[PDB]
């Protein structure tokens, strides 16, 4: 990093630091040289044990953060690094050894640290040795402190300390229901974006109600992120990361206006966010970082959304756009699994036989809980990627994940413990209680493919291969051995529980499928075995 540079302020980190974006595109956290933000170090706060919120509980911290935010957010500042501390001595830091790049930050001729100090919103560090590194405008900082003292400002004031009371109904369903009608009736409410969870979900501060809420953008579907929950590991939807950054760079810590239309089961309010005359839902669609949802159809913003989506789709970009390690010995470790579903593209789902009892126990517990607390028919509008419970054709409830929301009557779900898919009406869906989520029992179904064989490209040929497998192993216990991973799901070999005959090899024997050769040494023998079968077919 250079000693001097001009950079754009992306976030105000409390009262003594900011995050800037360099011309190179990199982000840097910069602390203000020779000043300390207000801190509660030295005072007892047992009354706030594990409930202390620095922004609101530290004397003058809110005032300092707001002064900096209003003056700098989204602006270009002139920076000159004065010194670097290898490890901050502050009591609370993350991590325990945290470097601090300390600089003089100026804009329009105003030294930011000097301005904070003059208002008593920061204090000047005193140095024991004249050789200690300090701000290059140190004398000006001390002059500012004299003014703060003279005028009794901020931390130098003798007046009663200003108290800040801020309610927080973030992701709280019962509390959200209490506020919904009021927020809907208020029309456009002023708010400050405090956090951005993704391209479309944010945490907002509403000054008029001195309350914090979580908010989801209406009328669109924004790409979801990665997952690595128990039994569910996958990359995020395309451009989920860029969408988040788009929203962060545009609205983080900006004053915006929001219209609340409804709320979801998680306590998130759903509505429209307006920033400097623009509609965020429309902007995301315009930049091809989200798509229009059917909920937008009855909205006055529908035309703008369609126009944006039209231009985005024409560009055909963004949302509209394997060898393995060689090993000496081949795996060979067959374990009992229960094959539940065979897919049309010759893939299949299985459950671990060893945990079958755990799934049974969970289903009894969950279904008994559902029987006691029946989901309200039609009061649930699922969001893509959300977990839920779904009522299958057998009339029983199962854990599921929403994969696509076509309309209120057509919700595409995936039964996470079995592997089958179904299109159902929202009336046959309900919320999945935390007590029965993957936090308690992992998703039980795992997707696998046959190793060493090529899935027929010819529909009729593939259908015949699938029918054979369904007939031979669907809904039966088999032995499975993981051979290797792929760009998709893992490839395995299956053996019949009794004869222990290789299921995939059998498809080769019958001439239903061709062999897919692997180059890795561990498969030297098995590839010859498969190629021989193919020859004799």
Short mmCIF file of C-alpha atoms in Angstrom, two decimals:
data_model
loop_
_atom_site.label_atom_id
_atom_site.label_comp_id
_atom_site.label_asym_id
_atom_site.label_seq_id
_atom_site.Cartn_x
_atom_site.Cartn_y
_atom_site.Cartn_z
CA UNK A 1 0.00 0.00 0.00
CA UNK A 2 1.20 3.52 -0.83
CA UNK A 3 1.71 6.21 1.81
CA UNK A 4 -0.71 8.56 0.05
CA UNK A 5 -3.85 7.95 -1.97
CA UNK A 6 -7.39 9.09 -2.68
CA UNK A 7 -10.06 6.48 -1.94
CA UNK A 8 -13.84 6.12 -1.66
CA UNK A 9 -15.41 5.61 1.78
CA UNK A 10 -17.40 2.36 1.78
CA UNK A 11 -18.22 2.07 5.50
CA UNK A 12 -17.67 3.95 8.75
CA UNK A 13 -16.34 1.48 11.31
CA UNK A 14 -17.63 3.06 14.50
CA UNK A 15 -15.73 6.23 15.49
CA UNK A 16 -12.03 5.83 14.69
CA UNK A 17 -11.96 3.82 11.48
CA UNK A 18 -13.32 3.70 7.94
CA UNK A 19 -13.16 1.21 5.09
CA UNK A 20 -12.04 2.65 1.76
CA UNK A 21 -11.91 1.33 -1.78
CA UNK A 22 -8.68 2.03 -3.68
CA UNK A 23 -8.35 2.75 -7.40
CA UNK A 24 -6.97 -0.78 -7.74
CA UNK A 25 -10.28 -2.14 -6.48
CA UNK A 26 -8.92 -3.37 -3.15
CA UNK A 27 -10.49 -2.46 0.19
CA UNK A 28 -8.50 -1.17 3.16
CA UNK A 29 -9.50 -0.47 6.76
CA UNK A 30 -7.95 2.83 7.84
CA UNK A 31 -7.78 4.10 11.42
CA UNK A 32 -7.40 7.79 12.29
CA UNK A 33 -3.93 8.60 13.57
CA UNK A 34 -3.30 9.77 17.13
CA UNK A 35 -6.89 9.58 18.39
CA UNK A 36 -8.96 7.09 20.37
CA UNK A 37 -12.70 6.63 19.91
CA UNK A 38 -14.83 6.68 23.04
CA UNK A 39 -14.45 3.42 24.96
CA UNK A 40 -15.87 1.91 28.13
CA UNK A 41 -12.48 0.49 29.13
CA UNK A 42 -12.11 0.92 32.88
CA UNK A 43 -15.84 1.04 33.66
CA UNK A 44 -18.02 -1.81 34.90
CA UNK A 45 -20.81 -2.88 32.56
CA UNK A 46 -22.26 -5.94 34.31
CA UNK A 47 -25.71 -4.42 33.73
CA UNK A 48 -25.04 -5.05 30.02
CA UNK A 49 -23.51 -8.53 30.30
CA UNK A 50 -23.81 -10.26 26.91
CA UNK A 51 -26.31 -7.64 25.73
CA UNK A 52 -23.98 -4.67 25.31
CA UNK A 53 -24.17 -2.92 21.94
CA UNK A 54 -21.14 -0.59 21.55
CA UNK A 55 -22.80 1.66 18.98
CA UNK A 56 -25.56 2.59 21.41
CA UNK A 57 -24.05 1.88 24.83
CA UNK A 58 -20.65 3.61 24.66
CA UNK A 59 -20.89 7.33 25.61
CA UNK A 60 -20.94 9.50 22.46
CA UNK A 61 -20.18 6.55 20.14
CA UNK A 62 -23.43 6.97 18.24
CA UNK A 63 -22.83 10.70 17.90
CA UNK A 64 -19.32 10.06 16.58
CA UNK A 65 -20.40 7.33 14.13
CA UNK A 66 -23.19 9.52 12.78
CA UNK A 67 -20.92 12.54 12.39
CA UNK A 68 -18.50 10.47 10.32
CA UNK A 69 -21.18 8.60 8.38
CA UNK A 70 -23.08 11.69 7.23
CA UNK A 71 -19.88 13.46 6.26
CA UNK A 72 -18.00 10.61 4.56
CA UNK A 73 -20.12 7.70 3.36
CA UNK A 74 -19.68 7.33 -0.40
CA UNK A 75 -17.20 10.22 -0.62
CA UNK A 76 -13.61 10.42 -1.88
CA UNK A 77 -11.12 11.20 0.91
CA UNK A 78 -7.44 12.15 0.78
CA UNK A 79 -5.31 9.76 2.82
CA UNK A 80 -1.77 9.97 4.19
CA UNK A 81 -0.56 7.05 6.31
CA UNK A 82 1.32 8.28 9.38
CA UNK A 83 2.24 5.05 11.17
CA UNK A 84 1.39 1.37 11.62
CA UNK A 85 0.75 -0.41 14.92
CA UNK A 86 1.64 -4.13 14.72
CA UNK A 87 -1.01 -4.96 17.32
CA UNK A 88 -3.74 -2.76 18.77
CA UNK A 89 -3.71 -2.43 22.58
CA UNK A 90 -7.50 -1.97 22.72
CA UNK A 91 -9.19 -4.45 25.08
CA UNK A 92 -11.66 -5.57 22.44
CA UNK A 93 -10.14 -6.48 19.09
CA UNK A 94 -10.66 -9.18 16.48
CA UNK A 95 -8.38 -11.01 16.20
CA UNK A 96 -6.35 -10.77 19.44
CA UNK A 97 -3.40 -9.44 17.42
CA UNK A 98 -4.79 -6.84 15.03
CA UNK A 99 -2.61 -4.49 12.99
CA UNK A 100 -3.69 -0.86 12.65
CA UNK A 101 -2.79 1.37 9.71
CA UNK A 102 -3.16 4.88 11.09
CA UNK A 103 -3.54 7.87 8.81
CA UNK A 104 -4.51 11.48 8.41
CA UNK A 105 -7.79 11.54 6.47
CA UNK A 106 -8.96 14.78 4.89
CA UNK A 107 -11.79 16.01 2.68
CA UNK A 108 -12.52 19.52 1.44
CA UNK A 109 -9.75 20.82 3.66
CA UNK A 110 -11.19 19.26 6.81
CA UNK A 111 -9.00 16.89 8.82
CA UNK A 112 -11.53 14.28 10.00
CA UNK A 113 -9.72 13.40 13.24
CA UNK A 114 -9.39 17.09 14.02
CA UNK A 115 -13.12 17.62 13.53
CA UNK A 116 -14.00 14.69 15.81
CA UNK A 117 -11.62 15.88 18.51
CA UNK A 118 -13.00 19.44 18.43
CA UNK A 119 -16.47 18.03 19.16
CA UNK A 120 -15.15 15.75 21.88
CA UNK A 121 -16.18 12.70 19.85
CA UNK A 122 -12.61 11.36 19.95
CA UNK A 123 -9.63 12.05 22.22
CA UNK A 124 -5.99 12.71 21.39
CA UNK A 125 -3.36 10.13 22.27
CA UNK A 126 -0.47 11.50 24.35
CA UNK A 127 3.05 10.24 23.78
CA UNK A 128 5.75 9.49 26.34
CA UNK A 129 8.73 9.76 23.98
CA UNK A 130 9.22 12.44 21.32
CA UNK A 131 10.36 9.61 19.06
CA UNK A 132 6.98 7.87 19.12
CA UNK A 133 5.25 7.86 15.73
CA UNK A 134 2.22 10.13 15.57
CA UNK A 135 -0.13 12.05 13.30
CA UNK A 136 1.60 14.44 10.91
CA UNK A 137 -0.92 17.07 12.07
CA UNK A 138 -0.54 16.39 15.79
CA UNK A 139 -0.33 20.03 16.90
CA UNK A 140 -3.63 20.67 15.13
CA UNK A 141 -5.23 17.75 16.98
CA UNK A 142 -4.14 19.11 20.37
CA UNK A 143 -5.42 22.56 19.39
CA UNK A 144 -8.76 20.90 18.64
CA UNK A 145 -8.75 19.23 22.06
CA UNK A 146 -8.28 22.60 23.73
CA UNK A 147 -11.43 23.80 21.98
CA UNK A 148 -13.40 20.71 23.00
CA UNK A 149 -12.31 21.31 26.61
CA UNK A 150 -12.95 25.06 26.47
CA UNK A 151 -16.44 24.50 25.02
CA UNK A 152 -17.16 21.39 27.08
CA UNK A 153 -18.03 19.18 24.11
CA UNK A 154 -18.63 15.44 23.96
CA UNK A 155 -16.36 13.48 26.29
CA UNK A 156 -15.14 16.77 27.73
CA UNK A 157 -18.66 17.92 28.59
CA UNK A 158 -19.78 17.82 32.23
CA UNK A 159 -23.45 17.46 31.32
CA UNK A 160 -25.47 14.28 31.78
CA UNK A 161 -24.38 11.67 29.21
CA UNK A 162 -26.86 11.27 26.32
CA UNK A 163 -28.63 7.90 26.50
CA UNK A 164 -29.68 6.00 23.39
CA UNK A 165 -32.55 3.52 23.50
CA UNK A 166 -32.99 1.47 20.33
CA UNK A 167 -35.45 -1.40 20.01
CA UNK A 168 -34.59 -4.36 17.80
CA UNK A 169 -37.26 -6.53 16.19
CA UNK A 170 -34.85 -8.10 13.68
CA UNK A 171 -35.93 -11.54 12.48
CA UNK A 172 -38.48 -11.75 15.30
CA UNK A 173 -41.78 -13.09 13.98
CA UNK A 174 -44.06 -12.21 16.92
CA UNK A 175 -42.65 -8.68 17.24
CA UNK A 176 -42.74 -8.14 13.47
CA UNK A 177 -46.46 -8.97 13.41
CA UNK A 178 -47.00 -6.26 16.01
CA UNK A 179 -45.27 -3.64 13.85
CA UNK A 180 -46.49 -4.70 10.40
CA UNK A 181 -49.73 -2.67 10.20
CA UNK A 182 -48.01 0.45 11.52
CA UNK A 183 -45.14 0.21 9.04
CA UNK A 184 -47.55 -0.47 6.18
CA UNK A 185 -49.61 2.60 7.12
CA UNK A 186 -46.56 4.85 7.49
CA UNK A 187 -45.92 4.77 3.75
CA UNK A 188 -42.28 5.66 3.03
CA UNK A 189 -40.21 5.51 6.23
CA UNK A 190 -36.77 7.02 6.65
CA UNK A 191 -34.07 4.48 7.43
CA UNK A 192 -30.32 3.98 7.53
CA UNK A 193 -28.84 0.74 6.20
CA UNK A 194 -26.74 -0.79 9.01
CA UNK A 195 -26.01 -4.18 7.44
CA UNK A 196 -26.30 -6.03 4.13
CA UNK A 197 -26.70 -9.81 4.45
CA UNK A 198 -26.98 -10.46 0.72
CA UNK A 199 -28.06 -8.73 -2.46
CA UNK A 200 -31.64 -8.52 -1.20
CA UNK A 201 -31.75 -8.72 2.62
CA UNK A 202 -30.67 -5.87 4.88
CA UNK A 203 -30.83 -4.67 8.47
CA UNK A 204 -32.25 -1.17 8.81
CA UNK A 205 -32.41 1.52 11.49
CA UNK A 206 -35.62 3.57 11.50
CA UNK A 207 -34.84 6.91 13.27
CA UNK A 208 -38.49 7.90 13.78
CA UNK A 209 -39.26 4.66 15.61
CA UNK A 210 -35.73 4.28 17.02
CA UNK A 211 -35.99 0.64 15.98
CA UNK A 212 -33.96 -1.92 14.03
CA UNK A 213 -35.62 -4.27 11.52
CA UNK A 214 -34.58 -6.76 8.82
CA UNK A 215 -35.85 -6.14 5.30
CA UNK A 216 -36.22 -8.15 2.08
CA UNK A 217 -36.53 -6.47 -1.32
CA UNK A 218 -39.89 -7.00 -3.02
CA UNK A 219 -40.72 -8.03 -6.58
CA UNK A 220 -37.53 -9.91 -7.37
CA UNK A 221 -35.58 -13.12 -6.90
CA UNK A 222 -31.92 -12.55 -6.04
CA UNK A 223 -29.29 -15.34 -6.32
CA UNK A 224 -28.69 -17.18 -3.01
CA UNK A 225 -25.26 -17.98 -1.59
CA UNK A 226 -23.23 -21.10 -0.82
CA UNK A 227 -24.32 -23.81 1.60
CA UNK A 228 -22.40 -26.23 3.78
CA UNK A 229 -24.96 -27.28 6.36
CA UNK A 230 -25.07 -30.85 7.67
CA UNK A 231 -25.86 -32.99 4.62
CA UNK A 232 -26.14 -30.03 2.23
CA UNK A 233 -22.94 -28.74 0.62
CA UNK A 234 -23.17 -26.67 -2.56
CA UNK A 235 -21.92 -23.53 -4.27
CA UNK A 236 -24.20 -20.51 -4.43
CA UNK A 237 -26.37 -19.50 -7.36
CA UNK A 238 -24.52 -17.61 -10.11
CA UNK A 239 -23.62 -14.03 -9.19
CA UNK A 240 -24.87 -14.16 -5.61
CA UNK A 241 -21.54 -12.63 -4.56
CA UNK A 242 -21.64 -9.77 -7.06
CA UNK A 243 -25.24 -9.00 -6.07
CA UNK A 244 -24.24 -8.64 -2.41
CA UNK A 245 -21.36 -6.32 -3.31
CA UNK A 246 -23.59 -4.26 -5.59
CA UNK A 247 -26.02 -3.60 -2.74
CA UNK A 248 -23.23 -3.02 -0.20
CA UNK A 249 -21.42 -0.46 -2.37
CA UNK A 250 -24.63 1.44 -3.11
CA UNK A 251 -26.66 1.51 0.10
CA UNK A 252 -24.51 0.53 3.09
CA UNK A 253 -24.92 3.24 5.75
CA UNK A 254 -26.89 5.46 3.36
CA UNK A 255 -30.11 7.19 4.33
CA UNK A 256 -32.88 5.58 2.29
CA UNK A 257 -36.67 5.36 2.31
CA UNK A 258 -38.61 2.10 2.57
CA UNK A 259 -42.20 1.04 1.95
CA UNK A 260 -43.29 -2.04 3.89
CA UNK A 261 -45.72 -4.30 2.03
CA UNK A 262 -45.68 -7.53 4.04
CA UNK A 263 -43.45 -9.88 6.05
CA UNK A 264 -42.17 -13.44 5.83
CA UNK A 265 -42.29 -16.25 8.41
CA UNK A 266 -38.81 -15.32 9.66
CA UNK A 267 -39.75 -11.82 10.78
CA UNK A 268 -38.27 -10.06 7.75
CA UNK A 269 -40.38 -7.22 6.40
CA UNK A 270 -40.83 -7.26 2.61
CA UNK A 271 -40.92 -4.03 0.65
CA UNK A 272 -39.37 -1.42 -1.61
CA UNK A 273 -36.14 0.41 -0.85
CA UNK A 274 -35.51 3.81 -2.44
CA UNK A 275 -32.06 5.37 -2.60
CA UNK A 276 -31.55 8.86 -4.05
CA UNK A 277 -34.58 8.62 -6.34
CA UNK A 278 -33.90 5.05 -7.46
CA UNK A 279 -35.60 1.75 -6.59
CA UNK A 280 -33.10 -0.91 -5.45
CA UNK A 281 -35.19 -3.85 -6.69
CA UNK A 282 -35.24 -2.20 -10.11
CA UNK A 283 -31.49 -1.46 -10.00
CA UNK A 284 -30.56 -5.09 -9.25
CA UNK A 285 -32.69 -6.33 -12.15
CA UNK A 286 -31.26 -3.60 -14.40
CA UNK A 287 -27.72 -4.73 -13.61
CA UNK A 288 -28.68 -8.37 -14.26
CA UNK A 289 -28.14 -9.27 -10.59
CA UNK A 290 -31.73 -10.39 -9.94
CA UNK A 291 -34.84 -11.41 -11.88
CA UNK A 292 -38.43 -10.19 -11.72
CA UNK A 293 -40.75 -12.24 -9.49
CA UNK A 294 -44.50 -12.73 -10.01
CA UNK A 295 -45.20 -10.74 -6.84
CA UNK A 296 -44.26 -7.63 -8.83
CA UNK A 297 -47.16 -8.07 -11.28
CA UNK A 298 -49.71 -6.20 -9.15
CA UNK A 299 -47.23 -3.45 -8.27
CA UNK A 300 -47.01 0.06 -9.69
CA UNK A 301 -43.31 -0.68 -10.22
CA UNK A 302 -44.05 -3.61 -12.53
CA UNK A 303 -43.42 -1.58 -15.69
CA UNK A 304 -40.02 -0.31 -14.51
CA UNK A 305 -39.02 -3.81 -13.44
CA UNK A 306 -39.98 -5.33 -16.80
CA UNK A 307 -38.15 -2.61 -18.72
CA UNK A 308 -35.00 -3.22 -16.67
CA UNK A 309 -35.22 -7.00 -17.03
CA UNK A 310 -35.72 -6.58 -20.78
CA UNK A 311 -32.47 -4.65 -21.20
CA UNK A 312 -30.59 -7.02 -18.89
CA UNK A 313 -31.71 -10.21 -20.65
CA UNK A 314 -30.64 -8.79 -24.02
CA UNK A 315 -27.05 -8.42 -22.80
CA UNK A 316 -27.08 -12.14 -21.96
CA UNK A 317 -24.67 -11.74 -19.03
CA UNK A 318 -24.62 -12.54 -15.31
CA UNK A 319 -27.95 -14.00 -14.18
CA UNK A 320 -28.81 -14.22 -17.89
CA UNK A 321 -25.50 -15.71 -19.06
CA UNK A 322 -12.66 -33.71 -13.89
CA UNK A 323 -9.43 -35.62 -13.20
CA UNK A 324 -8.78 -36.76 -9.63
CA UNK A 325 -5.73 -37.34 -7.44
CA UNK A 326 -3.78 -40.44 -8.44
CA UNK A 327 -3.56 -43.03 -5.68
CA UNK A 328 -1.78 -46.36 -5.28
CA UNK A 329 -4.70 -48.53 -4.21
CA UNK A 330 -8.37 -48.41 -5.17
CA UNK A 331 -10.80 -47.57 -2.34
CA UNK A 332 -12.85 -50.77 -1.93
CA UNK A 333 -14.91 -50.06 1.20
CA UNK A 334 -18.55 -51.09 0.74
CA UNK A 335 -21.16 -49.79 3.18
CA UNK A 336 -24.92 -50.47 3.45
CA UNK A 337 -27.21 -47.83 1.97
CA UNK A 338 -30.89 -47.65 1.10
CA UNK A 339 -31.61 -46.53 -2.47
CA UNK A 340 -34.68 -44.28 -2.45
CA UNK A 341 -34.86 -42.69 -5.91
CA UNK A 342 -33.49 -43.20 -9.41
CA UNK A 343 -33.46 -40.08 -11.61
CA UNK A 344 -34.11 -39.81 -15.35
CA UNK A 345 -30.46 -38.93 -15.96
CA UNK A 346 -29.25 -42.13 -14.28
CA UNK A 347 -28.34 -40.61 -10.92
CA UNK A 348 -29.76 -41.93 -7.65
CA UNK A 349 -30.29 -40.98 -4.02
CA UNK A 350 -29.48 -43.15 -1.02
CA UNK A 351 -29.74 -42.99 2.77
CA UNK A 352 -27.23 -44.31 5.31
CA UNK A 353 -28.71 -47.50 6.78
CA UNK A 354 -26.83 -46.85 10.03
CA UNK A 355 -28.83 -43.65 10.67
CA UNK A 356 -32.21 -44.95 9.56
CA UNK A 357 -33.45 -45.00 13.16
CA UNK A 358 -32.49 -41.36 13.67
CA UNK A 359 -34.55 -40.33 10.64
CA UNK A 360 -37.47 -42.40 11.93
CA UNK A 361 -37.28 -40.77 15.35
CA UNK A 362 -37.09 -37.28 13.85
CA UNK A 363 -40.12 -37.88 11.63
CA UNK A 364 -42.22 -39.12 14.58
CA UNK A 365 -41.17 -36.15 16.70
CA UNK A 366 -41.74 -33.67 13.85
CA UNK A 367 -45.08 -35.12 12.77
CA UNK A 368 -46.34 -35.23 16.35
CA UNK A 369 -45.31 -31.60 16.76
CA UNK A 370 -47.12 -30.72 13.51
CA UNK A 371 -50.25 -32.56 14.69
CA UNK A 372 -50.22 -30.35 17.78
CA UNK A 373 -49.43 -27.15 15.86
CA UNK A 374 -50.95 -27.47 12.34
CA UNK A 375 -49.53 -25.09 9.73
CA UNK A 376 -52.08 -22.51 8.56
CA UNK A 377 -53.14 -23.32 5.00
CA UNK A 378 -52.25 -20.57 2.54
CA UNK A 379 -50.44 -18.34 5.04
CA UNK A 380 -47.01 -19.27 3.71
CA UNK A 381 -45.27 -17.70 0.70
CA UNK A 382 -41.97 -19.64 0.30
CA UNK A 383 -38.74 -18.06 -0.93
CA UNK A 384 -36.38 -19.92 -3.26
CA UNK A 385 -33.73 -21.82 -1.28
CA UNK A 386 -35.74 -21.81 1.95
CA UNK A 387 -36.19 -24.93 4.09
CA UNK A 388 -39.73 -26.01 4.93
CA UNK A 389 -42.00 -28.99 5.47
CA UNK A 390 -44.07 -30.39 2.60
CA UNK A 391 -47.07 -32.73 2.57
CA UNK A 392 -46.41 -35.64 0.20
CA UNK A 393 -49.03 -37.73 -1.63
CA UNK A 394 -49.12 -40.22 1.25
CA UNK A 395 -50.56 -37.40 3.33
CA UNK A 396 -47.47 -37.22 5.58
CA UNK A 397 -45.19 -34.22 6.18
CA UNK A 398 -41.51 -34.29 5.21
CA UNK A 399 -38.54 -31.92 5.40
CA UNK A 400 -37.98 -30.09 2.14
CA UNK A 401 -36.22 -27.26 0.35
CA UNK A 402 -37.85 -24.87 -2.10
CA UNK A 403 -36.05 -25.00 -5.45
CA UNK A 404 -38.28 -22.84 -7.64
CA UNK A 405 -41.33 -20.66 -7.02
CA UNK A 406 -43.40 -20.59 -10.22
CA UNK A 407 -46.58 -19.28 -8.57
CA UNK A 408 -48.45 -19.70 -5.26
CA UNK A 409 -49.96 -22.91 -6.64
CA UNK A 410 -46.72 -24.21 -8.15
CA UNK A 411 -43.85 -24.51 -5.69
CA UNK A 412 -41.06 -26.87 -6.72
CA UNK A 413 -39.65 -28.69 -3.70
CA UNK A 414 -36.96 -31.26 -3.00
CA UNK A 415 -37.43 -33.74 -0.14
CA UNK A 416 -34.02 -33.53 1.53
CA UNK A 417 -34.22 -36.89 3.30
CA UNK A 418 -35.44 -38.93 0.31
CA UNK A 419 -34.35 -37.30 -2.93
CA UNK A 420 -37.62 -37.01 -4.84
CA UNK A 421 -39.07 -33.77 -6.19
CA UNK A 422 -42.60 -32.49 -6.51
CA UNK A 423 -44.50 -29.38 -7.60
CA UNK A 424 -46.98 -28.41 -4.89
CA UNK A 425 -49.34 -25.57 -3.92
CA UNK A 426 -48.28 -23.33 -1.02
CA UNK A 427 -51.23 -24.81 0.88
CA UNK A 428 -49.29 -28.06 1.26
CA UNK A 429 -46.19 -26.34 2.66
CA UNK A 430 -45.34 -25.18 6.16
CA UNK A 431 -42.43 -23.91 8.23
CA UNK A 432 -39.65 -26.22 9.44
CA UNK A 433 -39.04 -25.71 13.16
CA UNK A 434 -35.39 -25.31 14.27
CA UNK A 435 -35.85 -28.39 16.44
CA UNK A 436 -36.14 -30.51 13.29
CA UNK A 437 -33.72 -28.70 10.95
CA UNK A 438 -30.38 -29.87 9.57
CA UNK A 439 -28.91 -28.28 12.70
CA UNK A 440 -30.32 -31.32 14.53
CA UNK A 441 -30.27 -34.10 11.91
CA UNK A 442 -28.39 -33.79 8.59
CA UNK A 443 -30.30 -34.05 5.30
CA UNK A 444 -30.46 -37.84 4.90
CA UNK A 445 -30.42 -38.24 1.11
CA UNK A 446 -27.20 -38.15 -0.92
CA UNK A 447 -27.01 -37.91 -4.71
CA UNK A 448 -24.68 -40.35 -6.48
CA UNK A 449 -23.83 -41.54 -9.99
CA UNK A 450 -22.45 -44.83 -11.30
CA UNK A 451 -18.69 -44.88 -11.76
CA UNK A 452 -16.99 -46.02 -14.97
CA UNK A 453 -20.11 -45.77 -17.13
CA UNK A 454 -21.43 -43.22 -19.59
CA UNK A 455 -25.03 -42.12 -19.19
CA UNK A 456 -26.74 -42.72 -22.57
CA UNK A 457 -27.36 -39.48 -24.47
CA UNK A 458 -30.18 -41.13 -26.41
CA UNK A 459 -33.41 -40.62 -24.44
CA UNK A 460 -34.77 -44.09 -25.23
CA UNK A 461 -31.43 -45.71 -24.39
CA UNK A 462 -31.27 -43.78 -21.11
CA UNK A 463 -34.88 -44.65 -20.27
CA UNK A 464 -34.09 -48.35 -20.68
CA UNK A 465 -31.05 -48.05 -18.43
CA UNK A 466 -33.09 -46.23 -15.80
CA UNK A 467 -35.91 -48.79 -15.92
CA UNK A 468 -33.39 -51.57 -15.38
CA UNK A 469 -31.87 -49.88 -12.33
CA UNK A 470 -35.25 -48.94 -10.85
CA UNK A 471 -36.37 -52.55 -11.18
CA UNK A 472 -33.17 -53.92 -9.66
CA UNK A 473 -32.40 -51.53 -6.80
CA UNK A 474 -35.00 -48.83 -6.18
CA UNK A 475 -36.26 -49.03 -2.59
CA UNK A 476 -33.75 -51.71 -1.61
CA UNK A 477 -30.65 -52.00 0.56
CA UNK A 478 -27.35 -52.21 -1.35
CA UNK A 479 -23.63 -51.90 -0.71
CA UNK A 480 -21.95 -48.72 -1.91
CA UNK A 481 -18.33 -47.75 -2.47
CA UNK A 482 -17.23 -44.21 -3.32
CA UNK A 483 -14.84 -44.37 -6.26
CA UNK A 484 -14.12 -40.68 -6.93
CA UNK A 485 -15.60 -37.19 -7.06
CA UNK A 486 -16.67 -35.28 -10.17
CA UNK A 487 -17.67 -31.76 -11.17
CA UNK A 488 -21.09 -32.88 -9.98
CA UNK A 489 -21.92 -35.66 -7.51
CA UNK A 490 -19.59 -38.49 -6.43
CA UNK A 491 -19.30 -41.57 -8.64
CA UNK A 492 -19.71 -44.92 -6.93
CA UNK A 493 -20.06 -48.63 -7.56
CA UNK A 494 -23.02 -50.52 -6.11
CA UNK A 495 -23.24 -54.18 -5.16
CA UNK A 496 -26.34 -56.24 -4.49
CA UNK A 497 -26.60 -57.10 -0.79
CA UNK A 498 -26.74 -60.84 -1.54
CA UNK A 499 -24.88 -61.80 -4.71
CA UNK A 500 -22.67 -58.74 -4.28
CA UNK A 501 -22.72 -58.32 -8.04
CA UNK A 502 -21.62 -54.97 -9.46
CA UNK A 503 -24.83 -53.19 -10.50
CA UNK A 504 -23.19 -50.76 -12.91
CA UNK A 505 -21.08 -53.50 -14.50
CA UNK A 506 -24.32 -55.38 -15.08
CA UNK A 507 -25.68 -52.50 -17.15
CA UNK A 508 -22.53 -52.86 -19.24
CA UNK A 509 -23.00 -56.62 -19.58
CA UNK A 510 -26.55 -56.15 -20.89
CA UNK A 511 -25.30 -53.55 -23.35
CA UNK A 512 -27.53 -50.88 -21.81
CA UNK A 513 -24.64 -48.47 -21.25
CA UNK A 514 -21.09 -47.90 -22.50
CA UNK A 515 -17.93 -47.58 -20.40
CA UNK A 516 -16.42 -44.23 -19.42
CA UNK A 517 -12.68 -44.73 -19.01
CA UNK A 518 -10.67 -43.14 -16.18
CA UNK A 519 -6.92 -42.47 -16.58
CA UNK A 520 -5.99 -42.63 -12.87
CA UNK A 521 -3.81 -45.57 -11.83
CA UNK A 522 -6.13 -46.71 -9.02
CA UNK A 523 -8.67 -47.71 -11.68
CA UNK A 524 -6.29 -49.67 -13.90
CA UNK A 525 -7.82 -53.06 -13.08
CA UNK A 526 -11.47 -52.07 -12.90
CA UNK A 527 -11.33 -50.24 -16.24
CA UNK A 528 -10.07 -53.42 -17.93
CA UNK A 529 -12.81 -55.41 -16.20
CA UNK A 530 -15.42 -52.96 -17.51
CA UNK A 531 -13.95 -52.74 -21.02
CA UNK A 532 -13.97 -56.55 -21.18
CA UNK A 533 -17.66 -56.62 -20.26
CA UNK A 534 -18.35 -54.02 -22.94
CA UNK A 535 -16.56 -56.18 -25.51
CA UNK A 536 -18.55 -59.30 -24.64
CA UNK A 537 -21.74 -57.27 -25.11
#
